[PDB]
Amino acid sequence: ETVWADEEFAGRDFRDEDLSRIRTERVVFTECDFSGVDLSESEHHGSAFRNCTFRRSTIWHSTFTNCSLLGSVFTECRIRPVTFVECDFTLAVLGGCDLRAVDLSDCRLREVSLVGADLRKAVLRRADLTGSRVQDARLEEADLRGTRVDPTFWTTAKVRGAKIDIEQALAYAAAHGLAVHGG
Amino acid sequence: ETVWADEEFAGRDFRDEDLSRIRTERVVFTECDFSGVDLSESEHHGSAFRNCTFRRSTIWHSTFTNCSLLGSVFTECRIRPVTFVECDFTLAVLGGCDLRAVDLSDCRLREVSLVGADLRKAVLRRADLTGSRVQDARLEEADLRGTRVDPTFWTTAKVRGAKIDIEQALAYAAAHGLAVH
Amino acid sequence: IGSTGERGLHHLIWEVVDNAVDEAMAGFATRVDVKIHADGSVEVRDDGRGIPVEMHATGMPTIDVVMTQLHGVSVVNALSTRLEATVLRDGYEWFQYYDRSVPGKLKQGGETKETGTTIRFWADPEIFETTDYNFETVARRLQEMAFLNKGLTIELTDERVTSKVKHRVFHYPGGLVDYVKHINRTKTPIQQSIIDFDGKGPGHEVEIAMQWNAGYSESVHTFANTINTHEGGTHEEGFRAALTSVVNRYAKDKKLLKDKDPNLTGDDIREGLAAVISVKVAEPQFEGQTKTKLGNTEVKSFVQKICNEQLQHWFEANPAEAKTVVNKAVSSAQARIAARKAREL
C-alpha cells in the first residue's frame, strides 16, 4: 500500500472514495469530509486530521500513532476496536460514540465532547480530560489512574467500578462536599 | 448532694421522682422507667442504664463518665447540652434526637438507632458507629475524623461538609463503588 | 521519609547518591560508582572531597554528626542495621562504622593524596516491607542524573542473581543536548539543530536544551537542583512566557502571522516541542505536599529573562528552521481557532 507522506489536503471531499488500508506519514488533512467513508485497517504516523468530519465513517482496526484529531467530529463513526498512541483529540466531538475497552492512555482529550459516550472498560491512564463534557458519559469499570479531570467529572460521569488513584479518591470526596483533613 | 453507689435497681418506675442533681457511682439500672423525669445537672460515674427508657426526660447539664446506656431509649429526650466521656451506647435508640454540636468522641455507638437523628456539627472523633442505623441521619459539618463506620454509612448518612480523614475518604469512594489503587 | 515500599527503599539510594552529585555540581567529583551487592547492601563511591573528618563543635568528629543527628545520610543510617563510611581526606584513608546508627571509633589508615567517599549501607528488613531494590528503577534514575551532570560518569553494577553481574555506564558529554536527542529518538526533528543555552544569576543558574519534532505532543522535562519537578513550577512558567513572546514577535516581524491576527498560544508553539530546563537554586522553595513544584518567585523572571535573550538570538540567526517552527505553530493556531468557533456554534 503506497505510503502518502508530507502532503496537505485542504477542504477536500472524500465521500466518493474507499480509503481502506491507506498508510500516511506526516499527512495533514484540514477541514476534509470523510462522512460514510471506509478508512478501516488504515495506518497513520504523525498525521493530522483537523476539523475533519468522520460522521458515519469506519476507522476500526486502524492505527494512529502520534496523530492530531484536533476539532474532528466522530458522530456515529464505527471506531472500536482501534489503536491510538499519544494522539491529540483537543475539541473533538465523540458524543454518543462506542469507545468501550479502547486504550486512550497518554492521549490529550482537552475540551472533547463525550456527552452520552460509552467508555465502559476504556483505558484512560494519564490522559488529559480537562474541560471535557461528560454529561451522561458511561465510564463504568474504566481505568482512570493518573487521568487529569475537573472536579465536576466526579459528580457527572458514571464511574461505578472505575479504577482511580489516591489523589483522585480525595478529589471524589471533595467533589461530593466532604472536607478531607490530611491533618 | 444525694449519692447512690454499688446498688442494683431492677424494673423500678422513677416517673414521679425529681432526680435533678443526683450523683450515681457504679449503679446498675436494669429496665427502669425515667420517662418525663428531670435528671438535669445529674452526675454518673461507671453507672449502667440497661434497656431503660428516657422518653421525654431532661438530662441537660448532666455528666456521664464511663457509663453504659446499653439498649436504652432516648426518644424526645432533652439532651443538649450534656457531657458524655467514654460511654457505651450499644443498641441505644436515639432516633429523631437533637444531638447537634454534642461531643460523643471516644464513645461506643455500635448498633445504635440514629434514624432521622440530627447530628449537624456533632463531634464524633474516634467513636465506633459500626452496625448503626443512620437512614435520614443529618451529619452535615459533623467531625467524623477517626470514627469507625460501615461502608453503607457513606451512602446513607447526610455528610455534606463533614470532616473526615484520608482513610475515610478512601472508604467513601469504595462505598460508591470506585476501585481505589 | 518516603514510604516503607519500593518508593522509600529506593530513597536510601537517592540520599547517598545525591551527596555524591552535590560534589559533582560543586566541580570536585567526576565519577560515581553504585553497586547492589549479593548481601543486599548498597555501595556508593565518589572521587569528591570526602565527608569532613576533623573534630566538630559537637564534641565528636564531623562525619559522626553527619550520620546521627537529622537536619542527609542520617535518614539512611537510621533505617539500616549497619552503615560503613570509607573517606579519603586531609592526606589519609579513614574508616568509620555504625550498628543501628551507634558509631564505632573513627579509625585512621595510611597516607594518600587522593580524595573521595564510599558509603555502604544495609537496609533494615524489619522496617521495609521489601529490601529487593529494582535494577531498572535505579538505572533510569542514574541515567537521568548523568544527563543533568555533563562532566560526570555514573557506573552501576548489580551482583544479585535471582556469578554474572548487570552492568551499565551513564556518561553524556552533551548533557541536556543528549537528553533532548534521547527524547526525540522515536520522533522526527524538523530542525537539524538542538538549541542549547545557559544563564548565571546570583543564587541561581539555568540550562535549556530544545528541539521541535513533527509530532503533536509537548515533551518538556523540568529540574530544580537535579530533582524532577514533575508538577512543574516557576522555572517552567518563566520558560513558557519567554517562548510565547519570542515566537509571536518573530512571526509578526517576518510576516508569517498577519498584523491583525490573534497571538499564538503556548499550546500552539509547544506542539512538537522536546525541551529540558535544569535550574540550580541556592535557596529553593517547594509547593504541594508532593514537593515536586518550584515556588521561588525570582526564578520565573530569571528564566524568562535568559530565555528571551537566548531564543531571540537563536531565531534571529536561524531563519530557515525558525520559519518551519513558526509555520507549524501558525497552522496549529488556525486549527485551534476553527475548532473552537465550530464547537461554540
XYZ file of C-alpha atoms in Angstrom:
709
model
C 0.000 0.000 0.000
C 1.728 3.209 -1.387
C 2.701 5.428 1.631
C 1.371 9.056 1.483
C 3.962 11.469 3.056
C 4.438 15.240 3.671
C 1.248 16.207 1.713
C -1.521 18.678 2.766
C -5.217 18.170 1.735
C -7.404 21.284 2.438
C -11.264 21.308 2.229
C -11.191 18.016 0.215
C -14.465 15.962 -0.062
C -13.616 12.177 0.138
C -17.258 10.863 0.460
C -16.878 9.342 -3.100
C -13.786 7.259 -2.004
C -12.708 3.903 -0.489
C -9.713 4.846 1.778
C -9.426 1.347 3.393
C -5.828 0.165 4.186
C -4.163 3.561 3.242
C -0.865 4.384 5.056
C 0.044 8.053 5.833
C 3.182 9.593 7.459
C 3.091 13.357 8.296
C -0.041 13.941 6.102
C -2.210 16.971 7.122
C -5.986 16.705 6.370
C -7.544 20.174 7.088
C -11.420 20.514 7.045
C -11.769 17.333 4.883
C -15.071 15.350 4.673
C -14.792 11.580 5.499
C -18.618 11.105 6.068
C -19.610 7.445 5.350
C -16.029 6.667 4.143
C -14.310 3.269 4.732
C -10.972 4.117 6.485
C -10.683 0.592 8.071
C -7.263 -1.131 8.616
C -5.527 2.237 7.768
C -2.175 3.328 9.376
C -1.118 6.896 10.362
C 2.197 8.124 11.871
C 2.366 11.873 12.758
C -0.642 12.664 10.501
C -3.181 15.397 11.303
C -6.979 15.098 10.821
C -8.022 18.610 11.931
C -11.581 19.990 11.907
C -12.492 16.941 9.669
C -15.880 15.096 9.779
C -15.906 11.275 10.322
C -19.783 11.220 10.596
C -20.881 7.565 9.911
C -17.339 6.501 8.712
C -15.445 3.278 9.666
C -11.920 3.627 11.241
C -11.940 0.236 13.087
C -8.758 -1.940 13.079
C -6.745 1.236 12.191
C -3.559 2.510 13.962
C -2.951 6.241 14.726
C 0.499 6.908 16.309
C 1.350 10.496 17.430
C -1.515 11.917 15.249
C -3.725 15.030 15.724
C -7.548 14.608 15.663
C -7.965 18.263 16.867
C -11.553 19.528 16.355
C -12.682 16.429 14.315
C -16.300 15.070 14.580
C -16.781 11.282 15.128
C -20.656 11.228 15.396
C -21.830 7.618 14.633
C -18.264 6.621 13.498
C -17.513 2.854 13.788
C -14.327 3.310 15.959
C -13.700 0.204 18.167
C -11.546 -1.725 18.139
C -8.734 0.707 17.161
C -5.164 1.666 18.222
C -4.425 5.288 19.309
C -0.886 6.009 20.694
C -0.311 9.553 22.106
C -2.996 11.207 19.924
C -4.449 14.725 20.440
C -8.300 14.830 20.451
C -8.481 18.518 21.660
C -12.004 19.948 20.907
C -13.050 16.761 19.007
C -16.713 15.589 19.128
C -17.105 11.976 20.394
C -20.701 12.414 21.722
C -22.678 9.135 21.727
C -19.604 7.188 20.407
C -18.941 3.493 21.265
C -15.377 3.631 22.761
C -15.810 0.521 25.014
C -12.415 -1.026 26.035
C -10.498 1.492 23.797
C -6.992 2.429 25.122
C -6.549 6.268 25.161
C -3.618 6.181 27.656
C -1.441 9.368 27.370
C -3.923 10.981 24.888
C -4.942 14.685 25.128
C -8.795 14.818 25.377
C -8.914 18.512 26.426
C -12.418 20.120 25.882
C -13.679 16.976 23.997
C -17.434 16.278 23.845
C -18.062 12.826 25.398
C -21.838 13.607 26.023
C -23.595 10.173 26.140
C -20.310 8.462 25.042
C -19.811 4.761 26.041
C -16.276 4.376 27.596
C -17.099 1.286 29.749
C -13.787 -0.628 30.363
C -11.921 2.142 28.424
C -8.226 2.506 29.494
C -7.602 6.252 30.079
C -4.344 6.226 32.155
C -2.508 9.613 32.350
C -4.964 11.080 29.752
C -5.998 14.772 29.996
C -9.837 15.115 30.144
C -9.729 18.744 31.470
C -12.646 20.904 30.182
C -14.278 17.795 28.584
C -18.115 17.434 28.519
C -19.069 14.078 30.215
C -22.830 14.595 30.846
C -24.414 11.064 30.604
C -20.897 9.593 29.792
C -20.562 5.872 30.824
C -17.082 5.353 32.477
C -18.138 2.169 34.429
C -15.023 -0.046 35.054
C -12.761 2.369 33.057
C -9.084 2.664 34.099
C -8.763 6.370 35.162
C -5.496 6.088 37.170
C -3.387 9.269 36.660
C -6.111 10.832 34.385
C -6.478 14.636 34.795
C -10.213 15.514 35.276
C -12.114 18.606 36.547
C -13.774 18.092 39.970
C -17.328 18.117 38.336
C -16.225 14.918 36.492
C -16.747 13.001 39.788
C -20.449 14.153 40.107
C -21.277 13.929 36.321
C -19.648 10.817 34.707
C -20.961 7.312 35.627
C -17.802 5.817 37.276
C -19.195 2.751 39.180
C -16.287 0.186 39.293
C -13.731 2.646 37.748
C -10.045 2.348 38.816
C -8.672 5.587 40.383
C -5.540 6.622 42.414
C -5.368 8.074 45.999
C -5.317 11.763 44.741
C -8.470 11.057 42.605
C -10.258 9.446 45.647
C -9.560 12.676 47.659
C -10.984 14.769 44.726
C -14.022 12.385 44.556
C -14.815 13.125 48.253
C -14.228 16.929 47.924
C -16.458 16.989 44.773
C -19.262 15.410 46.944
C -18.706 18.130 49.608
C -16.627 16.122 52.173
C -13.897 18.180 53.960
C -10.813 15.851 53.880
C -8.128 16.579 56.545
C -4.602 15.430 55.624
C -4.329 16.566 59.297
C -25.872 16.036 97.061
C -27.880 12.693 97.012
C -25.321 9.864 96.240
C -26.221 6.260 95.177
C -23.289 3.759 94.907
C -22.756 -0.002 94.225
C -26.580 -0.515 94.095
C -28.708 -2.539 91.589
C -32.259 -1.332 90.610
C -34.426 -3.791 88.550
C -37.765 -2.837 86.866
C -38.084 0.318 89.062
C -40.563 3.101 87.991
C -38.969 6.577 88.681
C -41.574 8.673 86.694
C -42.978 10.541 89.776
C -39.444 11.389 91.141
C -37.333 14.580 90.761
C -33.798 13.153 90.171
C -32.201 16.564 89.369
C -28.610 16.996 90.709
C -28.311 13.291 91.913
C -24.899 11.551 91.736
C -24.622 7.777 90.982
C -21.350 5.748 91.142
C -21.277 2.104 89.848
C -25.133 1.897 89.958
C -26.795 -0.684 87.621
C -30.326 0.299 86.421
C -31.977 -2.683 84.583
C -35.305 -1.995 82.679
C -36.064 1.121 84.831
C -38.514 3.865 83.671
C -37.155 7.505 83.556
C -39.981 8.787 81.203
C -40.613 12.546 81.732
C -38.100 12.560 84.659
C -35.946 15.619 85.482
C -32.350 14.225 85.516
C -30.808 17.736 84.885
C -27.327 18.608 86.370
C -27.003 14.876 87.442
C -23.636 13.003 87.581
C -22.971 9.313 86.747
C -19.560 7.560 87.083
C -19.348 3.886 85.976
C -23.179 3.535 86.130
C -25.186 1.287 83.775
C -28.620 2.150 82.289
C -29.617 -1.153 80.568
C -32.872 -1.295 78.471
C -34.104 1.817 80.412
C -36.487 4.449 78.908
C -35.591 8.211 78.920
C -38.652 9.021 76.685
C -39.371 12.790 77.135
C -36.862 13.148 80.083
C -34.393 16.063 80.648
C -30.621 15.277 81.011
C -29.445 18.923 80.336
C -26.119 19.895 82.059
C -25.571 16.231 83.201
C -22.248 14.292 83.134
C -21.943 10.563 82.293
C -18.345 9.264 82.716
C -17.551 5.626 81.665
C -21.296 4.694 81.806
C -23.301 2.090 79.804
C -26.528 3.230 78.055
C -26.939 -0.316 76.537
C -30.325 -0.652 74.718
C -31.776 2.486 76.425
C -34.380 4.662 74.611
C -33.871 8.481 74.332
C -36.945 9.402 72.146
C -37.765 13.149 72.656
C -35.178 13.400 75.494
C -33.893 16.982 76.132
C -30.167 16.035 75.684
C -28.008 19.107 74.721
C -26.067 20.459 76.441
C -24.628 17.272 78.074
C -21.217 15.652 78.849
C -20.547 12.008 77.828
C -16.950 10.757 78.492
C -16.026 7.272 77.137
C -19.644 5.929 77.338
C -21.001 2.731 75.656
C -24.351 3.334 73.834
C -24.564 -0.209 72.283
C -28.126 -0.792 70.873
C -29.385 2.587 72.290
C -32.353 4.270 70.487
C -31.577 7.931 69.547
C -33.975 8.023 66.510
C -35.187 11.600 65.815
C -32.980 13.018 68.672
C -31.451 16.554 68.561
C -27.696 15.779 69.075
C -26.448 18.930 67.221
C -22.967 20.034 68.500
C -22.932 17.198 71.139
C -19.439 15.649 71.737
C -19.522 11.787 71.503
C -15.756 11.474 70.863
C -14.331 8.061 72.002
C -17.871 6.655 72.697
C -19.067 3.188 71.515
C -22.179 3.768 69.294
C -22.362 0.143 67.996
C -25.794 -0.886 66.550
C -27.353 2.481 67.686
C -30.563 3.756 66.008
C -29.831 7.282 64.690
C -32.805 7.084 62.184
C -33.819 10.732 61.428
C -31.420 11.919 64.184
C -29.915 15.450 63.904
C -26.076 15.293 64.472
C -25.214 18.513 62.484
C -21.855 19.869 63.871
C -21.742 16.904 66.344
C -18.150 15.929 67.371
C -17.761 12.146 66.779
C -13.911 11.712 66.752
C -12.523 8.142 67.271
C -16.092 6.804 68.018
C -17.406 3.376 66.842
C -20.626 3.646 64.713
C -20.364 0.026 63.374
C -23.789 -1.625 62.764
C -25.610 1.696 63.447
C -28.854 2.702 61.585
C -28.312 6.186 60.005
C -31.237 6.316 57.481
C -32.125 10.075 57.166
C -29.407 10.903 59.817
C -28.112 14.527 59.401
C -24.262 14.546 59.828
C -23.732 17.845 57.875
C -20.487 19.518 59.174
C -20.058 16.785 61.894
C -16.445 15.956 62.912
C -16.064 12.228 61.963
C -12.208 12.030 61.984
C -11.002 8.579 63.206
C -14.625 7.274 63.547
C -15.250 3.617 62.514
C -18.338 3.280 60.182
C -19.783 0.509 57.905
C -19.388 1.321 54.157
C -23.246 1.850 53.822
C -22.824 4.828 56.264
C -21.210 6.831 53.394
C -24.233 6.186 51.019
C -26.949 6.632 53.759
C -25.985 9.474 56.197
C -26.146 13.131 55.010
C -22.419 14.079 55.356
C -22.137 17.236 53.165
C -19.357 19.375 54.810
C -18.411 16.607 57.360
C -14.719 16.480 58.457
C -13.103 13.094 57.613
C -9.524 11.668 57.419
C -7.677 10.279 54.326
C -8.628 6.612 55.170
C -12.357 7.640 55.442
C -12.169 9.457 52.015
C -10.860 6.134 50.512
C -13.792 4.268 52.191
C -16.230 6.979 50.865
C -15.057 6.214 47.270
C -15.154 2.379 47.788
C -18.694 2.699 49.275
C -19.728 4.456 45.968
C -18.171 1.537 44.009
C -14.831 3.153 42.965
C -11.865 0.672 42.935
C -9.077 2.709 44.657
C -5.443 1.910 43.582
C 10.824 9.909 54.966
C 9.415 8.427 51.677
C 7.216 5.320 52.224
C 8.239 1.772 53.501
C 7.655 0.243 49.987
C 9.626 0.498 46.660
C 9.392 4.390 46.793
C 11.066 4.560 50.274
C 13.594 1.662 49.927
C 14.978 3.410 46.762
C 15.115 6.809 48.610
C 18.018 5.373 50.716
C 19.985 5.064 47.400
C 18.903 8.601 46.219
C 20.040 10.160 49.582
C 23.609 8.674 49.352
C 23.882 9.301 45.545
C 22.632 12.957 45.998
C 25.611 13.705 48.381
C 27.929 12.398 45.568
C 26.086 14.532 42.901
C 26.429 17.634 45.203
C 30.273 17.140 44.906
C 29.846 16.952 41.056
C 27.679 20.176 40.931
C 30.476 21.893 43.035
C 33.005 20.836 40.305
C 35.001 18.386 42.557
C 33.644 14.853 41.666
C 33.865 13.278 38.141
C 32.936 9.620 38.887
C 30.109 7.957 40.926
C 30.097 4.136 41.329
C 26.952 2.326 42.643
C 26.919 -1.431 43.470
C 23.988 -3.598 44.650
C 25.934 -6.425 46.420
C 24.618 -10.047 46.708
C 24.128 -9.407 50.512
C 21.504 -6.652 49.778
C 23.851 -3.805 50.909
C 24.356 -0.822 48.529
C 27.791 0.770 47.994
C 28.205 4.301 46.532
C 31.716 5.712 45.766
C 32.685 9.250 44.537
C 36.068 10.972 43.801
C 34.761 14.116 45.630
C 36.493 15.902 48.580
C 35.405 13.356 51.271
C 32.921 13.888 54.141
C 34.827 16.146 56.639
C 36.904 14.052 59.117
C 38.205 16.659 61.698
C 36.717 17.308 65.236
C 33.350 19.274 65.186
C 31.966 21.638 67.924
C 29.507 18.816 68.991
C 32.465 17.020 70.745
C 32.619 14.280 68.010
C 34.232 14.017 64.502
C 32.231 15.984 61.825
C 31.375 12.707 59.876
C 29.642 11.291 63.054
C 27.425 14.476 63.368
C 26.537 13.996 59.613
C 25.386 10.346 60.267
C 23.452 10.593 63.657
C 21.591 13.990 64.158
C 18.950 14.855 61.425
C 18.903 18.259 59.535
C 21.109 13.899 54.791
C 22.627 10.340 55.020
C 21.326 10.360 58.694
C 17.922 9.008 57.400
C 19.839 6.088 55.728
C 21.909 5.341 58.904
C 18.643 5.368 60.983
C 16.881 2.874 58.623
C 19.947 0.480 58.333
C 21.125 -2.396 60.648
C 24.633 -1.151 59.538
C 26.360 1.722 57.641
C 30.125 1.914 56.738
C 31.986 5.053 55.517
C 35.493 4.928 53.950
C 36.771 8.508 53.422
C 39.883 9.778 51.571
C 40.581 13.305 53.033
C 43.291 15.549 54.632
C 46.083 13.200 53.351
C 44.773 9.900 54.935
C 42.338 6.976 54.394
C 39.684 6.861 57.194
C 37.109 4.157 58.155
C 34.035 4.606 60.444
C 31.085 2.177 61.038
C 27.566 2.352 62.605
C 25.490 -0.563 64.080
C 21.818 0.629 64.180
C 23.316 4.201 63.916
C 25.546 3.752 67.059
C 29.035 4.919 65.893
C 32.308 2.985 66.375
C 35.617 4.926 66.843
C 36.787 6.753 63.634
C 39.993 4.871 62.553
C 42.944 6.468 60.635
C 44.513 4.281 57.863
C 47.556 5.180 55.680
C 48.544 8.327 53.706
C 47.144 9.289 50.240
C 46.881 12.494 48.107
C 43.530 11.016 46.749
C 40.166 12.488 47.989
C 36.687 10.811 47.950
C 33.931 8.982 49.927
C 32.464 5.415 49.954
C 29.146 4.656 51.762
C 27.902 1.058 52.156
C 24.507 0.577 53.932
C 22.308 -2.491 54.741
C 18.563 -1.538 54.641
C 16.762 -2.804 57.842
C 14.388 -5.640 56.740
C 12.277 -5.142 59.987
C 11.407 -1.544 58.713
C 10.987 -2.112 54.906
C 8.256 -4.492 53.514
C 10.744 -5.420 50.695
C 14.592 -4.872 50.667
C 14.600 -6.090 46.993
C 15.795 -2.980 45.039
C 14.776 -2.729 41.309
C 17.751 -2.550 38.848
C 15.615 -0.871 36.081
C 14.381 1.855 38.523
C 17.954 2.567 39.828
C 19.383 2.602 36.245
C 16.643 5.043 34.989
C 17.336 7.469 37.927
C 21.205 7.318 37.486
C 20.881 7.856 33.684
C 18.713 10.970 34.432
C 21.449 12.241 36.878
C 24.124 11.686 34.157
C 22.097 13.784 31.605
C 21.960 16.621 34.216
C 25.717 16.492 35.183
C 27.773 16.740 31.886
C 31.215 16.111 33.494
C 30.067 13.009 35.456
C 30.421 9.250 34.678
C 27.997 7.030 36.690
C 28.687 3.258 36.756
C 26.026 0.775 38.044
C 26.733 -2.910 38.979
C 24.003 -5.259 40.404
C 25.684 -8.511 41.721
C 22.372 -10.251 42.717
C 21.355 -13.378 40.662
C 17.612 -14.004 41.489
C 28.435 -15.227 39.208
C 27.157 -12.836 36.405
C 26.578 -9.045 37.041
C 24.183 -6.478 35.474
C 26.436 -3.502 34.481
C 25.651 -0.018 32.985
C 27.788 3.120 32.325
C 25.948 6.522 32.018
C 28.168 9.286 30.534
C 26.617 12.125 28.409
C 29.248 14.748 27.433
C 26.476 16.755 25.620
C 24.361 16.854 28.866
C 20.850 18.342 28.216
C 21.663 18.197 24.430
C 21.970 14.361 24.739
C 18.753 14.369 26.889
C 16.815 16.107 24.012
C 18.358 13.682 21.440
C 17.061 10.794 23.692
C 13.538 12.400 23.969
C 13.420 12.922 20.137
C 14.900 9.445 19.222
C 11.481 7.933 18.241
C 10.206 11.273 16.729
C 11.158 13.259 13.591
C 13.096 16.516 14.286
C 12.017 19.351 11.880
C 15.292 21.261 12.601
C 18.908 19.831 12.288
C 19.976 21.980 15.328
C 19.405 21.350 19.002
C 19.036 24.731 20.764
C 21.315 24.871 23.862
C 21.971 27.910 26.114
C 22.546 28.828 29.813
C 22.400 31.870 32.163
C 24.046 32.706 35.558
C 22.293 34.896 38.226
C 23.073 35.484 41.958
C 21.939 32.324 43.870
C 20.673 30.613 40.633
C 21.760 29.204 37.197
C 19.683 27.798 34.243
C 20.494 25.459 31.322
C 17.942 24.773 28.479
C 18.053 22.334 25.520
C 15.200 22.215 22.960
C 14.326 20.793 19.516
C 10.952 20.605 17.692
C 9.681 17.356 16.145
C 6.884 16.816 13.518
C 4.523 15.418 16.231
C 1.593 16.987 18.163
C 2.675 16.468 21.848
C 4.757 18.537 24.283
C 7.678 16.637 25.983
C 9.200 19.275 28.347
C 11.118 17.956 31.398
C 11.919 20.313 34.327
C 14.568 20.073 37.094
C 15.396 22.208 40.160
C 18.850 21.298 41.615
C 18.771 17.841 39.844
C 15.268 16.911 41.275
C 12.446 16.147 38.754
C 9.815 18.910 39.279
C 7.007 16.615 37.869
C 4.326 19.233 38.905
C 6.497 21.951 37.182
C 6.738 25.472 38.729
C 8.251 28.990 38.331
C 11.225 27.848 36.131
C 8.681 26.250 33.676
C 6.353 29.352 33.824
C 9.420 31.619 33.185
C 10.368 29.481 30.138
C 6.765 29.223 28.760
C 6.200 33.047 28.891
C 9.565 33.823 27.147
C 8.982 31.219 24.359
C 5.369 32.511 23.658
C 6.698 36.167 23.416
C 9.762 35.352 21.207
C 7.740 33.212 18.674
C 4.865 35.850 18.470
C 7.378 38.764 17.974
C 9.260 36.760 15.280
C 6.060 35.541 13.461
C 4.942 39.223 13.321
C 8.427 40.576 12.288
C 8.774 38.034 9.397
C 5.017 38.403 8.426
C 4.348 34.623 8.976
C 1.363 35.821 11.108
C -0.802 38.820 9.967
C -0.676 42.138 11.962
C -4.486 41.772 12.653
C -4.421 38.013 13.618
C -4.566 36.946 17.334
C -1.279 35.887 19.124
C -0.159 32.213 19.007
C -0.959 30.380 22.334
C 1.543 28.217 24.300
C -0.463 25.116 23.154
C 0.266 26.239 19.513
C 4.030 26.947 19.980
C 4.898 23.868 22.214
C 3.188 21.323 19.890
C 6.136 19.034 18.927
C 8.489 20.654 21.473
C 11.133 18.426 23.166
C 12.851 20.566 25.868
C 14.739 20.247 29.161
C 15.001 23.040 31.771
C 17.567 22.488 34.588
C 17.776 25.286 37.220
C 20.108 25.498 40.242
C 18.737 27.496 43.268
C 20.992 28.442 46.264
C 17.787 28.681 48.444
C 14.998 26.549 46.873
C 11.273 26.807 47.916
C 8.836 23.889 47.108
C 4.954 23.860 46.940
C 2.442 20.960 47.420
C 2.995 18.075 49.947
C 4.280 16.248 46.772
C 7.105 18.892 46.963
C 7.597 18.437 43.144
C 6.719 22.152 42.329
C 9.285 25.069 42.449
C 7.662 28.225 44.013
C 10.773 30.567 44.035
C 9.337 33.940 42.767
C 12.625 35.404 41.331
C 13.348 32.187 39.278
C 10.315 32.942 36.956
C 11.767 36.359 35.866
C 15.411 34.990 35.837
C 14.491 32.064 33.489
C 12.093 34.267 31.415
C 14.862 36.970 31.081
C 17.527 34.430 29.938
C 15.188 32.534 27.515
C 14.038 35.919 25.974
C 17.703 36.920 25.276
C 18.942 33.480 24.012
C 15.803 32.492 21.958
C 15.669 35.994 20.237
C 19.379 35.446 19.303
C 18.725 31.875 18.004
C 15.519 32.736 15.996
C 17.409 35.800 14.528
C 20.438 33.610 13.488
C 18.484 30.575 12.071
C 15.821 31.865 9.626
C 15.051 28.574 7.700
C 14.438 26.411 10.867
C 12.598 29.325 12.607
C 10.195 29.550 9.576
C 9.480 25.731 9.797
C 8.767 26.033 13.575
C 6.636 29.241 13.330
C 4.629 27.818 10.312
C 3.930 24.625 12.378
C 2.602 26.808 15.258
C 0.590 29.072 12.806
C -1.180 26.047 11.165
C -1.873 24.696 14.730
C -3.307 28.130 15.796
C -5.667 28.207 12.728
C -6.976 24.652 13.506
C -7.473 25.508 17.226
C -9.408 28.803 16.387
C -11.587 26.964 13.728
C -12.232 24.013 16.161
C -13.380 26.457 18.937
C -15.623 28.606 16.604
C -17.325 25.343 15.362
C -17.850 23.920 18.935
C -19.314 27.342 20.155
C -21.822 27.304 17.161
